[PDB]
Amino acid sequence: RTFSYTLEDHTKQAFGIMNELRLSQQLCDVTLQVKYQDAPAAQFMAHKVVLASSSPVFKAMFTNGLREQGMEVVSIEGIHPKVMERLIEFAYTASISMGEKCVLHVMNGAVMYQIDSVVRACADFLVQQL
């Protein structure tokens, strides 16, 4: 006779640890350098495999069948640092939070990164405001 087991909380617990490693800057292999209009420059370190798991655009950007030695710097354009921050957090935690009046900027960043679940959620909000 065979024998299976599934831990239902596993992926949640594991993303908990991945987020701690991001915040401690351990095992990170990408730095996103975000410059937007005249807002001050910001950097966010991350794990390519986690970004790729949440965004088809990151996935295509990092999958070039001939990956670098370690730490890639990526220049990002036309998205505000706070918006990037919240999308990175979403990728690592499955949750996003914003004031009523950032929701459009967030949707703008989410479309650009093809993070479809948050595009949908923000679209729902905006329509309810009518």
Curated annotation (Swiss-Prot):
Instruction: Fill in the PTM field for this protein.
Output: Non-enzymatic covalent modifications of reactive cysteines by electrophile metabolites inactivate the BCR(KEAP1) complex. Accumulation of fumarate promotes the formation of cysteine S-succination (S-(2-succinyl)cysteine), leading to inactivate the BCR(KEAP1) complex and promote NFE2L2/NRF2 nuclear accumulation and activation. Nitric oxide-dependent 8-Nitro-cGMP formation promotes cysteine guanylation (S-cGMP-cysteine), leading to NFE2L2/NRF2 nuclear accumulation and activation.
The PTM S-nitrosocysteine maps to C102
- List modified residues, type S-(2-succinyl)cysteine: C102
Query: Reported effect of changing C102 to W/Y?
Result: Substitution with a bulky side chain that mimicks covalent modification by an electrophile; prevents ubiquitination and degradation of NFE2L2/NRF2, leading to constitutive activation of NFE2L2/NRF2 and subsequent expression of phase 2 detoxifying enzymes
Site (Sensor for electrophilic agents) location in chain: C102
Q: In which tissues is it expressed?
A: Broadly expressed, with highest levels in skeletal muscle.
Q: Which residues form the BTB domain?
A: 28-100
Per UniProt, location of the N5-[4-(S-L-cysteinyl)-5-methyl-1H-imidazol-2-yl]-L-ornithine (Arg-Cys) (interchain with C-151 in KEAP1) cross-link in this chain: R86
Location of the protein in the cell: Cytoplasm; Nucleus
What happens when you mutate R86A? Reduced formation of a high-molecular mass KEAP1 molecule when methylglyoxal accumulates
Q: Which family does it belong to?
A: Belongs to the KEAP1 family.
Q: What is known of its domains?
A: KEAP1 contains reactive cysteine residues that act as sensors for endogenously produced and exogenously encountered small molecules, which react with sulfhydryl groups and modify the cysteine sensors, leading to impair ability of the BCR(KEAP1) complex to ubiquitinate target proteins.
Its quaternary structure? Component of the BCR(KEAP1) E3 ubiquitin ligase complex, at least composed of 2 molecules of CUL3, 2 molecules of KEAP1, and RBX1. Interacts with NFE2L2/NRF2; the interaction is direct. Forms a ternary complex with NFE2L2/NRF2 and PGAM5. Interacts with (phosphorylated) SQSTM1/p62; the interaction is direct and inactivates the BCR(KEAP1) complex by sequestering it in inclusion bodies, promoting its degradation. Interacts with NFE2L1. Interacts with BPTF and PTMA. Interacts with MAP1LC3B. Interacts indirectly with ENC1. Interacts with SESN1 and SESN2. Interacts with HSP90AA1 and HSP90AB1.
Protein name as it appears in the record: Kelch-like ECH-associated protein 1
